[PDB]
């Protein structure tokens, strides 16, 4: 049951994360074409082979609706699967397994998952709340906003405060995530913070946003984008690189605000990762790498626990006693993660997937892992809201 591993990632492409002030301006339709063709060239396939497309539903600059039709028309493809997702940072992992499902279902042969994240040029004839809805009837508009609750920082901070009171807290242990991932980024010329190492005290000395989260434990919004090609296992054999099979997946959404979680310390990556490991017939100890969605340090540590890599409540202990660099025993976000490689909006989650593909394909350069067969990848949207997991295995 579940995915049988007959779909594989064969081509990737992504813009270098760059600050909004200086990043190139590109229409979202233009980005869709540019990123798809780049990823197709990386795979060694041409345009007419694409019979499936997945992208993000909200905030597509040129279309408030009919996004698949307009994007596919601009691209020039004939789609048997016209898909959009609306899961925030979890979107990237959500598109990957949907592409595999459609290919294993026989609907498609080759699916492109693409997320534009650069802003479009401005015309003379043409966000405070951080994504919270102000619409009449939206519960959070009347229950969150009047009290200052909004966006993501303070929500994740209240999760961190709950964890500290229940299981203990070590500010320096969480800072280990920033230091090791920055080390990884310091060996990635494409990373935003390439050549910019940090220390533990650097993180603690950075400004407090909301107790106990510091600015350096939080991603810096940036522009970018990315796309990935998924195709059938047989066609994958004649592509350019090692196929990266999609052998397990999981998805879970049980709340929007963390306030209505059954337990803010039981995050949805638990159920999602248990389904993905089960589907792949594998266990956390089988993985050679973990590309973990890292908008906040606390999200990484909670993913470490709930995905089964360490015991619930010993996350700080796991962070103190392990080396998370590409030279370490538990390589993690070996591209730098969104924290240090840069967060390209909703495409930031795709950096995790692409790095897993790079590592498995033997294309990671100075950061290449010795064991590069098996990868766990997570995606997280909102504040512990939307979650997905992937198990990937090289051919």
């Amino acid at each position: 049951m579940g995915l049988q591993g007959k779909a594989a990632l064969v081509g990737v492409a992504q813009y270098k994360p760059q600050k909004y002030a200086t990043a190139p301006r590109m229409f979202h339709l233009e980005q869709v074409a540019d990123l798809t063709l780049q990823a197709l060239e990386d795979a060694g396939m041409e345009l007419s082979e694409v019979d499936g497309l997945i992208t993000s539903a909200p905030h597509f600059h040129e279309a408030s609706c009919f996004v698949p039709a307009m994007a596919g028309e601009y691209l020039g493809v004939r789609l048997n699967f016209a898909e959009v997702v609306d899961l925030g940072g979890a979107s990237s992992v959500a598109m990957v397994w949907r592409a595999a499902a459609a290919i294993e279902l026989g609907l498609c042969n080759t699916v492109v998952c693409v997320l534009p994240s650069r802003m479009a040029p401005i015309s003379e004839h043409d966000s405070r709340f951080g994504g919270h809805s102000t619409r009449f009837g939206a519960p959070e508009a009347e229950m969150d906003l009047p009290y200052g609750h909004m966006a993501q920082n303070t929500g994740y901070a209240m999760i961190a405060q709950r964890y500290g009171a229940v299981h203990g807290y070590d500010a320096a242990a969480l800072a280990r995530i920033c230091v090791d991932q920055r080390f990884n980024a310091c060996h990635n010329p494409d990373a935003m913070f390439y050549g910019q190492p940090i220390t533990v005290d650097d993180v603690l000395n950075s400004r407090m946003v909301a107790d106990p989260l510091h600015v350096l434990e939080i991603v810096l919004p940036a522009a970018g984008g990315g796309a990935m090609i998924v195709t059938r296992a047989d066609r994958a054999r004649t592509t350019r690189h090692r196929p990266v099979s999609i052998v397990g997946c999981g998805e879970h959404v049980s709340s929007k605000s963390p306030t209505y979680m059954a337990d803010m310390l039981q995050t949805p990556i638990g159920p999602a990762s248990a389904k993905a490991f089960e589907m792949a017939g594998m266990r956390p100890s089988d993985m050679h790498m973990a590309q973990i969605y890292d908008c906040y340090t606390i999200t990484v540590m909670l993913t470490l626990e709930d995905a089964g890599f360490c015991e619930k409540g010993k996350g700080m202990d796991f962070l103190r006693n392990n080396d998370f660099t590409f030279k370490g025993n538990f390589p993690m976000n070996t591209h730098g993660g969104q924290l240090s490689f840069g967060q390209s909006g909703t495409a930031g989650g795709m950096s995790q997937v692409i790095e897993a593909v790079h590592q498995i394909q033997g294309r990671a350069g100075d950061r290449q892992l010795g064991r590069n067969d098996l990868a766990y990848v997570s995606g997280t949207g909102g504040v512990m809201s939307e979650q997905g997991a992937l198990i990937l295995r090289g051919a």
Partner: protein, 142 residues
């Protein structure tokens, strides 16, 4: 009051009206499930038989944080913002802020009691304080 205010719907109206009467009123389905935020159905069992009833309003601090950068510029006069999540004895959870408690004494699990904030004017907001503290139950408009 330049901050966001609630714009009640006909579904949530009885809750914001109860706060105006210095009461915390939540819905309970006919199978015994309390619910919040307000709906036209029970999010637990799907029953459509909902009854509004006053609750004592006391509970525990489920979690909190202290904003050192204001979440919005218009919350500067509330700084530092003691953002809080309260779980009433009924088991529902309410987003709010703490009043009359030093940020450094905030503690996950403290007993809390409601404070009705009339400063916005026509709208009454719901804040919380330490149950054993001396902070009054109402904050009148300036």
């Amino acid at each position: 009051w330049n901050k966001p205010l609630p714009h009640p719907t006909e579904i949530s109206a009885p809750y914001w009206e109860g706060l105006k009467a210095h009461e915390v009123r939540i819905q309970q389905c006919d199978r015994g499930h309390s619910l919040f935020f307000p709906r036209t159905h029970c999010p637990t069992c799907g029953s459509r038989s909902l009854k509004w009833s006053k609750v004592s309003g006391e509970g525990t601090l489920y979690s909190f944080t202290v904003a050192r950068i204001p979440t919005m510029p218009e919350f500067t006069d509330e700084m530092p913002q003691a953002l809080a999540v309260i779980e009433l004895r009924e088991g529902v959870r309410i987003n709010t802020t703490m009043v009359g408690v030093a940020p450094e004494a905030l503690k996950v699990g403290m007993e809390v009691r409601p404070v009705f904030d009339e400063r916005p004017g026509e709208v009454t907001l719901l804040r919380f304080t330490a149950h054993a503290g001396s902070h009054p139950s109402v904050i009148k408009a300036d």
